[PDB]
Amino acid sequence: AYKVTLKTPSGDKTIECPADTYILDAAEEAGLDLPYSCRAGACSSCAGKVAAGTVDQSDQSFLDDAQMGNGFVLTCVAYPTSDCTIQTHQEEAL
C-alpha cells in the first residue's frame, strides 16, 4: 500500500491506501469525511491538490489539462502510485 498524507484544513493525517483503491474511498474508510458528490470523476466536489507523490486519475473527466498539470486531483477516481501528499478541500482553489 501507499502512505497518503491528507493535508486537511484541520491538520495532517497519513493513511494507507492500496494501489487498487481510490484515495477518497480509503480516506472515508479511515474515518475522514472529505467532500464528494458524484463519485464518478465528473465534478469538482472531491478536488484535492497533490503536493508530492503521484496518482493515477486516468478515469477522471472534469479537470482540464492545466488543472491537472498544477496538481489538482479528483480524489474519488484517483489511485495512488507512490507515497503522496494531497491537500484536501481544494474545490474553491480550482
Ligand code: FES
Ligand atoms: S465527487 Fe464528483 S468528481 Fe469526485
